[PDB]
Write a protein that binds this ligand. Structure first.
Ligand SMILES: Cc1cc(-c2ccccc2)cc(C(=O)NNS(=O)(=O)c2cccc(O)c2)c1F
Ligand SMILES: [Zn+2]
Lengths: 267, 20
């Protein structure tokens, strides 16, 4: 029941965690997947036959973002059950804490792709509850291993907060995050308020106004302000310490940025 | 609408003066 590798597009990937693929498939230790419809197969011969006839060239759902070669597709788990189940089983090979794979109907899946000389390739995704009463704007979030640590994850995170902004909600990723996902959110949260603070020249700020603009949860903002040693306390008032050390170090960084004007989507 | 962080609690609505 342990899968060791998968064949995905032009990549062969070592898998990290158990995923409940049907035991008829799991016991072979290796899976061959169509990179477009996410069907999993037993042999590369079967895969080759499938790609020769597979009609899919991109995720289902509606393309709700496009800038250059980057797309985001909104996939309703109730309307594309099989695709989303295959997506969740694939994700479980690389996420330890994901627990839902088959009951995809409560979820929306936001799938990010890159178009290139071969095709329109899966970069990663995040799932999202259609009704989160705990204000999670992300359930699970992942980049494929061949695109990790290359700025794509930051785009995915930014897109999740872009949706929250349009919804006029504040949100947070559901916990526990993967190791890399927590590392990525902390770095993204730091960059976000450095841009806010660089673009802001009032002299007093509430957590609320930062949260309202960025859609970042107040808890995440304060812990980031403490992580950056910018949250100080003198007499009876809490202060924010503008380290231009950081706004300049951040200013030296720059494409892999989401363009809000390229979003065609309403709640 | 408050945050507990260490060892006191903040209000989301209080203006925090920015300094150097
Ligand atoms: C949420 C997330 C998850 C996973 C992931 C989790 C489990 C399995 C596989 C992937 C990977 C990434 C990523 O790619 N982070 N690096 S990043 O994009 O360059 C990046 C991200 C943020 C700020 C930066 O300054 C640079 C990510 F953001
Ligand atoms: Zn296919």
């Amino acid at each position: 029941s342990m899968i060791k590798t998968i064949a995905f597009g032009r990549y062969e990937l070592d898998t990290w965690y158990h995923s409940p693929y049907p035991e008829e498939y799991a016991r072979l230790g290796r899976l061959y997947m169509c990179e477009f419809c996410l069907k999993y197969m037993k042999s590369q011969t079967i895969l080759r036959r499938h790609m020769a006839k597979c009609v899919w060239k991109h995720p289902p759902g509606d393309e709700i973002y496009r800038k250059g070669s980057i797309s985001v597709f909104e996939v309703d788990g109730k309307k594309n059950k099989i695709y989303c189940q295959n997506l969740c089983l694939l994700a479980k090979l690389f996420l330890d804490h994901k627990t839902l794979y088959y009951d995809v109907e409560p979820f929306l899946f936001y799938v990010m792709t890159e178009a290139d000389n071969t095709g329109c390739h899966l970069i990663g995704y995040f799932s999202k509850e259609k009704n989160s009463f705990l204000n999670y704007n992300v359930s699970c979030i992942l980049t494929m291993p061949q695109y990790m640590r290359q700025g794509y994850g930051k785009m995915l995170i930014d897109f999740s907060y872009l949706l929250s902004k349009v919804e006029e909600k504040v949100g947070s990723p559901e916990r526990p995050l993967s190791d890399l996902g927590l590392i990525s959110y902390r770095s993204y949260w730091k960059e976000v308020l450095l841009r806010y603070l660089h673009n802001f020249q009032g002299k007093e700020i509430s957590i609320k106004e930062i949260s309202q603009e960025t859609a970042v949860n107040p808890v995440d903002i304060v812990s980031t302000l403490q992580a950056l040693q910018m949250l100080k306390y003198w007499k009876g008032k809490h202060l924010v310490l503008k380290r231009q050390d950081l706004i300049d170090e951040w200013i030296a960084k720059e494409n892999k940025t989401m363009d809000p004007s390229c979003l065609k989507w309403t709640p | 609408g408050m945050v507990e962080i260490e060892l006191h609690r903040i209000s989301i609505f209080d203006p925090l003066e920015i300094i150097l």
